[PDB]
Write a protein that binds this ligand. Structure first.
Ligand SMILES: [Mg+2]
Length: 281
């Protein structure tokens, strides 16, 4: 599958293959995302969850969050992909984490987008300054933080203030994806994926991992896509039969737009190729 990658490179046809994908991709209604009452719950007018796979919040008012369940039947793994929370949706974000019983959150964007403008900070920066989400009745505490060269892992305590029940959530933040373009080497992204796997966060004993970036479709899509293709290569008789384009189209049945550029598609192929070589040994 590496020689095919070499053939697409030699051919210069990454854009063509990427457009074949956008063309073939599923189209399902997003009627709930488009209701006038939810406008302010979407970060981007052109990225919405399909009605069929959207995550529903359990509380009473309005069950809408821009988040989709991606359920990969053959790999036996599920992910929830969601946009970076808005100042008004951080309460909803953690309510979803609570309700879906997720153990991990994986973030692939910057909160200070490029050098532009800091986005809503949805976890506490300081141990002594915990956050209380009044609308969803949740308290969130930073317990520890470990800053490595290419990612930061934080341990958070999430408490449901109704029941006083408490859960440890692991937050994995990949911090070195370049502000434009894609990493030239997938080695730190793969190491990050393997750290998240090692943590047990992706175990089917837990709710699905919550994955996000800016719109929850590009960098996020790369994480989910590389993870799933690597699972399938490890699970199939013939690891050889894994077709990344087919796996991505399958993912796109659950959330639109996964993998946002031809360069991200090529990077995803490259990460699966290098991952396989590493997991091959
Ligand atoms: Mg301090």
């Amino acid at each position: 599958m590496e020689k095919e990658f070499e053939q697409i490179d030699k051919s210069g046809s990454w854009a063509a293959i990427y457009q074949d994908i956008r063309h073939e991709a599923s189209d399902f209604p997003c009627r709930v995302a488009k209701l006038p009452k939810n406008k302010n719950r979407n970060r981007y007018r052109d990225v919405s969850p399909f009605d069929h796979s959207r995550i529903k919040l359990h509380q009473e008012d309005n069950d809408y969050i821009n988040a989709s369940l991606i359920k990969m039947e053959e790999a036996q793994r599920s992910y929830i992909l969601t946009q970076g929370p808005l100042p008004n949706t951080c309460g909803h974000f953690w309510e979803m984490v609570w309700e879906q019983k997720s153990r991990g959150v994986v973030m692939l964007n910057r909160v200070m987008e490029k050098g532009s403008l800091k986005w809503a900070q949805y976890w506490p920066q300081k141990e002594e300054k915990e956050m209380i989400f009044e609308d969803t009745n949740l308290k969130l505490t930073l317990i520890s933080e470990d800053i490595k060269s290419y990612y930061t892992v934080r341990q958070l305590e999430l408490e449901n203030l109704t029941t006083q029940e408490t859960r440890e959530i692991l937050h994995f933040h990949y911090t070195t994806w370049p502000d434009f373009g894609v990493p030239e080497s997938p080695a730190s992204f793969l190491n990050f994926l393997f750290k998240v796997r090692e943590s047990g966060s992706l175990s089917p004993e837990h709710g699905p991992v919550v994955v996000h970036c800016s719109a929850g479709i590009g960098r996020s899509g790369t994480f989910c896509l590389a993870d799933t293709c690597l699972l399938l290569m490890d699970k199939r008789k013939d690891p050889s039969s894994v077709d990344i384009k087919k796996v991505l189209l399958e993912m796109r049945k659950f959330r639109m737009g996964l993998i946002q550029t031809a360069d991200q598609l090529r990077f995803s192929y490259l990460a699966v190729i290098e991952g396989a070589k590493f997991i091959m040994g």
